[PDB]
């Protein structure tokens, strides 16, 4: 398949990165480096920018970059 | 015919149950020998002519009281007209029963004219395929 499979490998990786204590936000390409998704499509990139990373309640927009939402979650 | 249909349905269910799991099946255990051996027994024993609303009293215990009783019981017929029904027409002796059925032989009581038995010279035709007659007529004009 295509356009619907890489988002899970992004979200679980960033969740596990937050589990290591990396509260600081990360850019799209920085997440794409360690998720072996360097050949990802440009339309998938803009789809992640405009819909996929704003509709979920676990993604925070901090100074233009994307991070976890530990404030909404209970800690 | 009905019971062979039942046997085929049963072996179909068994073969499906051991073919959905994905292996071959042994034919000897597949065929239930219970069905044919028991149902014909049940129907001849009880006289109920079906797999228990069907016809009743088709089969009777043979009337071993005298030799004439045995013969008259073996050569008997039976009408399906409801024996309790207060009718008049089908029970009457009809003109076409000439040498077919005895005009004197009739039980007394509620079954007068519904039960009757064959005359001395009456062979009931047992059946034949109409294919030879049909192809014979096709040969002619």
């Amino acid at each position: 398949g295509y356009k619907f499979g890489v988002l899970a490998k992004i979200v679980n990786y960033m969740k596990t990165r937050h589990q290591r204590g990396d509260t600081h936000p990360l850019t799209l390409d920085e997440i794409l480096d360690e998720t072996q998704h360097l050949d990802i499509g440009l339309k998938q990139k803009q789809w992640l920018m405009t819909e996929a990373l704003v509709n979920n309640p676990k993604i925070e927009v901090i100074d233009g970059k994307y991070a976890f939402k530990p404030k909404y979650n209970v800690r | 015919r009905g019971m062979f249909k039942n046997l085929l349905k049963e072996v179909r269910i068994y073969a499906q149950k051991f073919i959905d799991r994905g292996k071959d099946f042994n034919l000897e255990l597949a065929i239930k020998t219970r069905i044919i051996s028991d149902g014909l027994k049940y129907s001849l024993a009880t006289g109920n002519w079906g797999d228990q609303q069907a016809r009743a009293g088709v089969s009777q215990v043979l009337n071993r009281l005298t030799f004439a009783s045995t013969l008259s019981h073996l050569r008997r017929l039976n009408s399906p007209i409801g024996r309790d029904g207060k009718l008049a027409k089908p029970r009457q002796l009809h003109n076409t029963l000439w040498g077919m059925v005895c005009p004197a032989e009739t039980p007394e009581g509620h079954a007068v004219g519904l039960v009757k038995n064959l005359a001395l010279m009456a062979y009931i035709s047992v059946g034949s395929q109409p294919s030879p007659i049909l192809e014979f007529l096709e040969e002619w004009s």
């Binding site: 398949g1 295509y2 619907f4 499979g5 899970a8 490998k9 979200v11 679980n12 979920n56 | 292996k23 071959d24 099946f25 042994n26 000897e28």
Partner: protein, 88 residues
Amino acid sequence: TNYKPVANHQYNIEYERKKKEDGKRARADKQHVLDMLFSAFEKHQYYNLKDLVDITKQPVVYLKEILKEIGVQNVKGIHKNTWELKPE
């Protein structure tokens, strides 16, 4: 020659033979079965549990334990309550 005394049925001995070399489903690591399940999810949206067991080739209880974390049951009155492989 009917119901000849035989120590084991031909179908039975073939099936029991075929269960020796195909083998029992070995418990695999989590990363490989996760990659397998998301790759299968890429093909089609919904799946039945028995179909996921056949495609992934994993023990039912273990696969059920892995997909309990990320997948979730959604009720469908058309046939049965089935699982969803989507994390959300």
